[PDB]
Design a protein around this ligand. Structure first.
Ligand SMILES: OC[C@H]1O[C@@H](O[C@H]2[C@H](O)[C@@H](O)[C@H](O)O[C@@H]2CO)[C@H](O)[C@@H](O)[C@H]1O
Length: 139
């Protein structure tokens, strides 16, 4: 299925089954959480002409990062649009990886896809670990 600029999606970890969630505890931390159709679990995609931005349907903040890209950098809500590269996974064409542009750092559900609600979403160097792959589909 198609992913289109202007549309809003939930983003589900292939390993864990939890979704990318803007924590209701602080409205800042990005975590894995069971899907309940919350608007803090919905992300409005925009194609800027060169990359993707992801805007929280609940807060209007954007999906971004805490500090310079590194293994373990936390994803956080940020004020300004933050650009991502989004590609189909090489092994699993149904899923995606979400990269900091022009780097090898992609979104990674921490603890190797720990299913625990509240597990942080982080950056990590790209590799086959399934906790780095995500489905993108309608809420
Ligand atoms: O804790 C992450 C979790 O937060 C939920 O929001 C809670 C929040 O934790 C609580 O502090 C606030 O006072 O009540 C909210 C509703 O129970 C989110 O609903 C969930 O999606 C996660 O983000």
């Amino acid at each position: 299925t198609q992913v289109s600029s202007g549309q809003t999606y939930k983003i589900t970890n292939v390993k864990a089954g939890t979704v990318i969630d803007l924590s209701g505890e602080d409205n800042k931390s990005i975590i894995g959480y069971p899907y309940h159709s919350g608007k803090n679990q919905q992300w409005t995609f925009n194609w800027t002409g060169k990359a993707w931005t992801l805007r929280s349907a609940s807060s209007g903040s954007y999906l971004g990062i805490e500090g310079t890209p590194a293994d373990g950098t936390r994803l956080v809500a940020v004020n300004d649009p933050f650009e991502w590269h989004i590609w189909r996974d090489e092994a699993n064409e149904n899923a995606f990886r979400i990269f900091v542009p022009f780097t090898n750092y992609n979104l990674d559900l921490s603890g190797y896809g720990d299913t625990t609600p509240g597990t942080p979403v982080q950056l990590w160097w790209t590799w086959e670990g399934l906790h780095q792959t995500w489905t993108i589909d309608r809420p």
